[PDB]
Design a protein around this ligand. Structure first.
Ligand SMILES: Nc1ncnc2c1ncn2[C@@H]1O[C@H](CSCC[C@H](N)C(=O)O)[C@@H](O)[C@H]1O
Ligand SMILES: [Zn+2]
Lengths: 175, 106, 366, 303, 172, 75
């Protein structure tokens, strides 16, 4: 009340959208669905697991191609300077390593899929295909999406950033 | 002197007017009828051929086979509403398998 | 930028709304309600300003003063009154023998209002001494004449109901220029109205030959007494033959907009090329009353049947505007990294075109 | 030399006089404390006008509009009210905040109202009625101080993080996010008349002035104590070229625009100076402090 | 180039010397049609340290799908800590005779490889050898692309060159 | 000589016309100057008719005069 200093000062936040409401066929030619019919099935809202999240107002069942993840693809040499700048600006570990030779940085350029979370009880698994000679990562669902839930995929890290989700099977860590 | 360039269209207008005059659809027609018909035929032909070209570049083949036209007409929904009871020579059918007929195991 | 491409809903603070006009760049809306009251709505802010109990019989037209201190209203009961923007009461009250069509204030002379009486010559009423000065006209004096200022209001132009257009001075009234409209091929044509712009001195003319024409307010004083008609583009609708009721000029000086009556066909062109670019998709059932764009930003807002329909450009800034050094774009190329890795004692004090239609001084936060 | 000499020591509140504001008109002072009281005091004479009340808990911020008609106070009863300066009654309600209201100010155009609480966001309400309009997330921490720009188009938002942000009022999204690697907690921000500079009173014993034109760090303003409490700031251009700001060494300090000099040290308040206010048309400064001061000192001057 | 002590550079743009991400405005820039001379000034015999590997399992030989590959790999964190200085320790970035001055000194002690560093799409021609300007002093950079018995004998010589150690090593 | 071609927007353009240069060549020069096609332009002198397939000397227009270039449509 302007006379008592409250704690939790440092934030290091970038996407300043945190709110307390969160009121939520052959292969090659499927490219259209990526760019045109892929902007309504998912909303952006306050995640309950950690930070921000991609909530849902629509439904998508099993084996349905949903999103293509794109970002600043760089080589592994830039990883050193990128991690130094992550430590400087207070940037999370956005080192999306599609492989050990190319990593998808998401601190200077990235897509709306930068809003995802991690938990040992996720809803979707990753998959990657190759169209027109270019390798692109597209996710296919295994179950149905309910209205008001958040997309999350298992990072598949073999067993210090904790993973605070509250799930019973949640290993509390990226492992 | 020509008449198609007066509106900038591509489909002929004199041909349409002559063919409609000898088609005995009526006895007397106005002036805007042939240009209007040329325009609407232009729009429909462009609508179909753009998807035809998209399907041509789908398989990386320069020539457009009728299979591409069949796929482009069928996959769209407004065309399927308008081309309801029409088939295509050599057209084939778009792939489709019923959902409940999909075996699986562990 | 370009023509409006999005659609907006309605703006109905109160159920009825007859007339609308923007002041200089679309600040406040002058609604003349069909109940004898004068309501002021807020534009670009979506609110209301003031309600004035003018008189019993409703009004049919509205405009504001050059200094923004008056609310002139072409009444349907011949109440030529100067309602105050500030207090809401009547400052000056006068009665005219004929009702008024088009009320305007000269951006350089608010003393002489614009009046368009019917079957009589236009009359300038001076607010300083309540004196009426009749505009000298030619030939008949019982025609449906409409009088209107130029861009600067320095010359006044009048249109009659037989085929004759007159040019004279807004203050000296030196009628030294006339004009005869083309007589078609066999039969002559009268003039319904004319409408001006804020840049270029162009003006549309609406006639009874079902065709909208365009002239410029510079070829009549240059030709002299009377010359030969020579429009730029005889625009018209040649598929339905919709008559024309109200049409204004663009908010940039290069477009032309024309309004239907009941067909919900709002047409647009450009002065450079007379080729149609877009058509408005309006829901049938209502009669259009007034149209006037934003005098600076491309947008269309048409009032009709007590409601208003706006076709606009709704805009929200992209998510990538967090900081100039922060972007949220997508690329598939490798990142291009950087390649290049006083003391004074002075305090701080510093804090279309523009015309004089300002100083409304009407805003009530509570 | 700023000869701001004390003339009146004002003390009417009970808990702690920690918010006194010299409005841009400079007609009356809306002294506030953490005792749900809004006392109207004089400026050139310190005459007692009245004590507008009606809220339930303490106030965190008080502000008057450009014409000093509206009165916003950060009452912690989950609501805010506008109190009529002429009479002293509740004009309109500002319900909607889910926790204690910590920051609230006005717009120089006198057409918008801003408020903020512990819901990681800020909100605005209608002036004629007072209904919900927007919920714009300001930062991830409770917001300490915000204010509209002099041109009425931008807002500078400060929370205890350090990454100072400028939020566009026309869209509700941030324009410049000046990010600090050290992330020093911020207490107060204020717009310059030109709307290009901002003074973010960072809680690191330094008034880190920010220029959001290019994203470069400005000079280091030292010569005070600023670590914990919500230190505010104001300008002073009447007598000379001065910028007044609070200090946590229990004293009132002033500096220059870009010289980094201790031009004036007003002493006498026994507690940490939490707020500083300077009169618009005269060299009069009133500084509010914490619990151990409870006094308002009018440092009048002429040059 | 210059990020580590192993590499030495002189920037083409504005001539600003850069090393270990540290930059000083030193000389003028170069670029289009600018031939960069290079004469590492050690005409006299020196001494250096060549090899000191820290890993072995990554140095193995196994069929990939139909052919062998020799995993001859370097390391980093161990090699950087064996860093030493040596004689004529100066990598001078000339300008075809004219020199702006050696930008950085105290070069790493080891086998020298003239590194050409690019940053985007750009072509560049080369001429290296124990000569001054004309490439053909020794055999003019033979590609060993011929069908005669010379290719056969050279390939067999190389085969034996590695066969001696693949016999005397002893495979796990 | 020199004459003025007044447009609709309000810009004034000064051009040079020879005593023995036909109007068609003047229109071609204008088209190569500012890009406005001859089909989009026609000459009007104080509300009086001027054609394209003629010459200035046939009309005998005085110097330093203004011509109302009343706008047209392509084709
Ligand atoms: N639940 C969690 N708790 C802590 N870190 C998490 C997390 N989920 C994902 N992360 C980490 O955060 C990084 C992405 S940044 C997190 C997404 C986004 N900033 C948001 O607000 O949601 C990933 O590299 C991942 O390792
Ligand atoms: Zn868990």
């Amino acid at each position: 009340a302007r006379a008592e200093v409250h704690l939790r000062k440092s934030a290091f936040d970038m996407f300043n959208f945190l709110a307390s409401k969160h009121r939520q066929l052959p292969m090659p030619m499927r490219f259209r669905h990526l760019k045109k019919t892929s902007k309504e099935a998912v909303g952006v809202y306050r995640s309950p697991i950690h930070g921000r999240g991609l909530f849902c107002k629509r439904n998508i069942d099993a084996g349905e191609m949903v999103i293509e993840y794109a970002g600043n693809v760089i080589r592994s040499i830039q990883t050193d300077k990128r991690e130094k700048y992550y430590d400087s600006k207070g940037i999370g570990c956005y080192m999306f390593r599609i492989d050990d030779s190319e990593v998808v940085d998401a601190t200077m350029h990235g897509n709306a899929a930068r809003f995802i979370n991690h938990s040992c009880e996720p809803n979707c698994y990753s998959r990657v295909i190759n169209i027109d000679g270019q390798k692109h990562i597209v996710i296919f669902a295994m179950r149905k999406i309910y209205r008001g839930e958040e997309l999350t995929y298992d990072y598949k890290f073999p067993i210090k950033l904790p993973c605070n989700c509250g799930a019973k099977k949640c290993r509390k860590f990226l492992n | 002197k020509t008449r198609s360039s007066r509106a900038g269209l591509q489909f002929p207008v004199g041909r349409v007017h002559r063919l409609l005059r000898k088609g005995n659809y009526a006895e007397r027609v106005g002036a805007g009828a042939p240009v209007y018909l040329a325009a609407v035929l232009e729009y429909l032909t462009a609508e179909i051929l753009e998807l035809a070209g998209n399907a041509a570049r789908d398989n990386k083949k320069t020539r457009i086979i009728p299979r591409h036209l069949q796929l482009a007409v069928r996959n769209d929904e407004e065309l399927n509403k308008l081309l309801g009871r029409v088939t295509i020579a050599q057209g084939g059918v778009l792939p489709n398998i019923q959902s409940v007929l999909l075996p699986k195991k562990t | 930028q370009n023509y409006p491409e999005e659609a907006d809903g309605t703006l109905d603070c109160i159920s009825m709304a007859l007339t609308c006009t923007f002041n200089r760049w679309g600040t406040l809306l002058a609604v003349g309600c069909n109940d004898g009251r004068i309501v002021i709505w807020d534009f670009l802010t979506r609110g209301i300003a003031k309600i004035i109990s003018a008189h019993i019989h409703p009004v049919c037209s509205l405009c504001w003063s050059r200094d923004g201190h008056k609310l002139v209203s072409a009444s349907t009961d011949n109440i030529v009154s100067q309602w105050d923007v500030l207090s809401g009461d009547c400052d000056q009250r006068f009665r005219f023998p004929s009702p008024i069509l088009k009320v305007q204030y000269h951006p350089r002379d608010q003393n002489k209002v614009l009046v368009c009486p019917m079957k009589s010559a236009p009359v300038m009423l001076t607010l300083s001494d309540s004196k009426h000065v009749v505009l000298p006209v030619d030939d008949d004096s019982d025609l449906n004449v409409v009088a209107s200022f130029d861009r600067r209001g320095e010359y006044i132009y009048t249109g009659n109901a037989k085929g004759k257009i007159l040019v004279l001075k807004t203050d000296s009234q030196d009628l030294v220029a006339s004009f005869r409209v083309t007589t078609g091929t066999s039969n002559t044509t009268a003039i319904k109205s004319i409408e001006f712009a804020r840049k270029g001195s162009c003006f549309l003319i609406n006639t009874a030959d079902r065709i909208i024409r365009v002239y410029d307010g510079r070829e009549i004083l240059t030709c002299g007494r009377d010359g030969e008609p020579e429009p730029m583009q005889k625009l018209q609708d040649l598929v339905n033959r919709t008559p024309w009721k109200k049409c204004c000029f663009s908010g940039d000086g290069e477009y032309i907009v024309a309004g239907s009556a009941r067909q919900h066909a709002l047409y647009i062109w450009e002065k450079s090329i007379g080729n149609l670019v877009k058509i408005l998709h309006g829901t049938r059932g209502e009669l259009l009353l007034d149209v006037a764009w934003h005098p600076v930003r491309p947008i269309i807002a048409s009032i009709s049947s007590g409601v208003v329909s706006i076709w606009a450009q709704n805009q929200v800034e992209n998510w990538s505007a967090f900081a100039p050094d922060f972007k949220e774009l997508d690329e598939n190329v490798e990142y291009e990294e950087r390649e290049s890795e006083e003391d004074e004692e002075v305090d701080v004090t510093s804090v279309d075109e523009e015309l004089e239609d300002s100083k409304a001084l009407l805003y009530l936060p509570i | 030399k700023p000869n701001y000499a004390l003339k009146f020591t004002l003390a009417g509140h009970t808990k702690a006089v920690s918010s006194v504001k010299f409005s841009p008109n400079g007609e009356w002072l809306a002294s506030s404390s953490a005792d749900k009281l809004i006392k109207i005091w004089g400026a050139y004479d310190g005459k007692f006008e009245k004590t507008i009340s009606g809220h339930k808990l303490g106030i965190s911020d008080v502000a008057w509009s450009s014409d000093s008609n509206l009165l916003v106070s950060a009452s912690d009863d989950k609501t805010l009210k506008i109190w009529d300066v002429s009479s002293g009654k509740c004009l309109k309600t500002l319900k909607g905040h889910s926790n204690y209201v910590f920051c609230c100010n006005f717009n120089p155009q006198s057409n918008l109202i801003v408020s903020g609480s512990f819901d990681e966001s800020v909100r605005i309400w209608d002036v004629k009625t007072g209904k919900c309009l927007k919920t714009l997330p300001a930062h991830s921490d409770p917001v300490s101080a915000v204010h509209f720009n002099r041109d009425g188009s931008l807002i500078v938002s400060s929370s205890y993080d350090g990454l100072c942000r400028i939020w566009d009022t026309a869209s509700g999204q941030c324009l410049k996010t000046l990010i600090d690697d050290d992330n020093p907690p911020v207490s107060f921000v204020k717009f310059s008349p030109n709307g290009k500079y901002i003074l973010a009173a960072t809680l690191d014993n330094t008034l880190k002035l920010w220029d959001y034109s290019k994203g470069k760090c400005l000079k280091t303003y030292t010569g005070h104590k600023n670590e914990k409490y919500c230190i505010f700031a104001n300008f002073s251009v009447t007598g000379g070229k001065w910028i007044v700001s609070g200090s946590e060494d229990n004293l009132v300090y002033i500096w220059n625009l870009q010289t980094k000099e201790i031009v004036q040290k007003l002493q006498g308040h026994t507690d940490v100076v939490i707020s500083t206010a300077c009169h618009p048309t005269e060299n009069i400064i009133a500084s509010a402090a914490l619990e151990n001061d409870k006094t308002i000192k009018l440092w009048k001057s002429d040059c | 180039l210059g990020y580590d002590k192993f590499s030495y550079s002189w920037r083409s743009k504005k001539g600003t010397k850069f090393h270990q991400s540290i930059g000083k405005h030193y000389s003028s820039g170069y670029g289009q049609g600018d031939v960069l001379g290079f004469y590492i000034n050690l005409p006299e015999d020196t001494e250096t340290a060549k090899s000191l590997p820290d890993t072995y399992k990554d140095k193995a030989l196994i069929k990939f799908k139909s052919y062998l590959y020799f995993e001859e790999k370097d390391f980093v964190d161990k090699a950087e800590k064996s860093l030493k200085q040596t004689p004529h320790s100066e990598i001078i970035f000339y300008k075809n005779g004219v020199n702006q001055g050696v930008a950085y000194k105290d070069i790493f002690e080891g086998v020298y490889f003239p590194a050409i560093s690019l940053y985007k799409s750009c072509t560049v021609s080369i001429n290296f050898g124990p000569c001054f300007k004309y490439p053909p002093k020794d055999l003019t950079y033979r590609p060993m692309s011929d069908m005669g018995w010379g290719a056969v004998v050279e390939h067999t010589l190389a085969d034996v060159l590695y066969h001696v150690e693949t016999e005397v090593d002893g495979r796990r | 000589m020199q004459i003025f071609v007044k447009t609709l927007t309000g810009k004034t353009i000064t051009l040079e016309v020879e005593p023995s240069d036909t109007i068609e060549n003047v229109k071609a020069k204008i088209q190569d100057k500012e890009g406005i096609p001859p089909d989009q332009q026609r000459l009007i002198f104080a509300g009086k008719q001027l054609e394209d397939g003629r010459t200035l000397s046939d009309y005998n227009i005085q110097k330093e005069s203004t011509l109302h270039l009343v706008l047209r449509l392509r084709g």
